[PDB]
Write a protein that binds this ligand. Structure first.
Ligand code: PLP
Ligand code: PLP
Ligand code: CL
Ligand code: CL
Ligand code: CL
Ligand code: CL
Ligand code: MG
Ligand code: MG
Ligand code: MG
Ligand code: MG
Ligand code: MG
Ligand code: MG
Ligand code: MG
Ligand code: MG
Ligand code: MG
Lengths: 387, 387
């Protein structure tokens, strides 16, 4: 037991979630339920690792000890049944930096790169900002409200594509893809000699009855065709420490990314990231399991509240991530109108669905990694906004 | 007064200086006097800013409050008499990453970039790793042992150059360029429409009777032709925190670098870098002044020791930086022989002059930002090596 009910003031915590809404929504005087970090304290093991490193009193250039990558190897093996080699790992300050460099190195200007919308908006922008062409294969929104891949669409568009960027679990719709769904996609990509970059940052935030399957874990051929991005940051609420890794089982790919990070001279973890990453994987599993029980309770509470109190809204329980994807289309409001009522009448900040691209219109994304009290206040504000 | 004589054992401090010699020198069992970080504890104000941040116990995405760039603006004004606008500042995790992106955006493949050797080795590799053409204008080593710029050579090689990368103060030779030296260089570059990137990371480490002059501060004409990189990291020994900034008074340059950082999605300080940077500039001046007295004492001690005890070596007192550039050529040993006898017999790890490019042969670089006891030991081991 860790006390996830505890409310922590973040008004003095140099938090973008609490302090950068003015830019985006027009004011900071809103209840923030938008950007994906949590309103929970880091695991005690993380905090103590930071304290111990702080007490050294010298903060020079940091070497990466073998125990760091060993912690990552062991995490992936015991949590995801995927045994990797330490030699396959590259440090990156974040997932999107790594994907950016990978796009620059693995493709030529104007090459086609495929994603599936609605999705995390940096997928769309990182392609365009690198002067490659973005090809969107929208997820299919079924008449039952759920989302699946559009395999027929992918096969129709795949012929001149060079890379496919997968979100697994998929933010914002909350899908934890099954082995069979991943096998179908992976076989298509292999048939067409398309490499997959799998963004698996949400890999540890998986609800009951679901299991994360790394795309690269399915078979040795999928392993060699997949470059995987993961991090401790979403799992343990340590984005402010900046730490991620890339698993590249193909040495040609490894060399290209290693050379790219040499080119921009980004090689070392900061000193706190170093210790917190190792501490989170070696010692954070008990906190994580407790977090996932608390999160599932928040999810169930939120869905029940919505279905009882805002019955015009439609919501499907996510299989993973701590983000809820809620359909407001029955209100008959344009996306701008919906944002305006939520901000001005509700005083609540949710992520606008349209920001995730095709299939986002009419939706809003709500962050449930917060104390129940804060979640309830958010739901009350939404109820007031739409009434 | 601060206790610079205190030895801080860095064996458990995940320090690259103490733990990465095996790669470069064959063995970890050497006294490290190479990589430029200090063997001193951080200023109290830094340690405590980190502790107070740590005790908030939430490490999510970090906003940059106005106070952070205000600290930088105020520092540049009161320390260097250079009044900048906060709107000119772009965050970078380091100086070389910023220069790398600057090179990619301000020039085309195979364009010419000029540097002055011997110089910090990333200046050479950042140009070549970006597939630009490197035009070296060696510094002129005078028969009195000092270094000046080779203006004739610059004028002869500059006609087709796009960018000039200036080191001010110049690592490793320790020059603090005078206003007149900088004016002469700047005018040559302006005549030929050559933009100057000025790496001024050593700007605060300035010895008595010398004064740092930002190239961009000389005039408005110079300001619009100059892009400046600075950081708290060398000053305050916080390279493990990762923080630097770029001053771009030209809005077109600002937009190109802003867009580059958007492309690789590196925008936010880590949470600890944020608080330490502001604390160092708002509260660290007293520590800095004390450090500069201790450093100058160490320099005077080392030069006296060398001239008395290793009289075939030649050394000139640095005007800036904490790095001592010592000529071993009178021993009649090759660079290879020299390196062997220092590592294997002295058991001392110095930076080999040849790593700094043209004009480095015969030289070794020693880091003097350590307790006197450690400096004495290094000098004793160098003496033992060459006897
Ligand atoms: C939050 C998030 C990230 C974070 O990216 P960084 O560049 O590591 O900050 C990456 N991918 C997805 C799908 C996310 O939701
Ligand atoms: C130490 C040093 C740097 C540091 O580079 P970062 O990329 O900030 O680590 C840059 N320039 C010079 C001249 C240096 O001596
Ligand atoms: Cl379904
Ligand atoms: Cl309703
Ligand atoms: Cl002489
Ligand atoms: Cl001698
Ligand atoms: Mg301790
Ligand atoms: Mg097959
Ligand atoms: Mg397997
Ligand atoms: Mg209903
Ligand atoms: Mg406090
Ligand atoms: Mg702000
Ligand atoms: Mg010209
Ligand atoms: Mg002599
Ligand atoms: Mg003595």
């Amino acid at each position: 037991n860790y006390n996830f009910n505890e409310i922590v003031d973040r008004s003095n915590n140099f938090s973008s979630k609490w302090s950068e809404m003015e830019k985006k929504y027009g004011t900071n005087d809103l209840l923030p339920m938008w950007v994906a970090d949590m309103d929970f304290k880091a695991a005690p093991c993380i905090i103590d690792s930071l304290k111990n490193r702080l007490e050294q009193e010298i903060y020079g250039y940091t070497t990466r000890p073998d125990s760091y990558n060993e912690s990552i190897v062991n995490w992936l093996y015991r949590r995801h049944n995927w045994k990797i080699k330490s030699e396959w790992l590259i440090y990156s300050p974040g997932v999107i930096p790594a994907i950016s460099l990978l796009i620059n190195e693995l493709t030529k200007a104007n090459d086609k790169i495929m994603i599936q919308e609605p999705v995390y908006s940096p997928f769309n922008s990182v392609v365009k900002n690198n002067n490659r062409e973005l090809i969107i294969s929208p997820l299919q929104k079924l008449e039952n409200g759920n989302y699946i891949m559009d395999y027929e669409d992918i096969e129709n568009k795949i012929k001149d594509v060079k890379l496919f960027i997968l979100c697994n679990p998929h933010n914002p719709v909350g899908r934890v893809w099954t082995k069979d769904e991943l096998k179908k996609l992976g076989d298509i990509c292999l048939k067409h000699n398309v490499k997959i970059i799998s963004d698996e940052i949400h890999s540890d935030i998986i609800l009951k009855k679901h299991k994360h399957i790394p795309m690269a874990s399915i078979s040795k051929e999928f392993e060699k065709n997949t470059i995987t991005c993961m991090a401790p940051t979403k799992t343990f609420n340590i984005a402010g420490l900046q730490s991620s890794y890339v698993v590249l089982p193909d040495e040609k790919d490894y060399k290209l990314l290693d050379d790219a990070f040499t080119r921009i001279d980004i090689k070392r973890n900061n000193c706190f990231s170093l210790v917190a990453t190792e501490a989170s994987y070696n010692n954070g599993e008990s906190w994580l399991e407790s977090f996932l029980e608390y999160l599932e309770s928040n999810i169930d509470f939120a869905i029940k509240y919505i279905n009882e109190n805002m019955p015009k809204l439609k919501v499907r329980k996510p299989e993973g991530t701590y983000l809820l994807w809620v359909d407001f289309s029955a209100l008959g409001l344009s996306d701008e109108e919906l944002e305006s009522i939520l901000v001005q009448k509700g005083k609540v900040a949710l992520n606008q669905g349209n920001s995730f691209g095709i299939g986002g219109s009419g939706y809003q994304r709500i962050n449930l990694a917060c104390p129940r009290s804060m979640l309830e206040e958010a739901l009350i504000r939404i109820k007031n906004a739409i009434n």
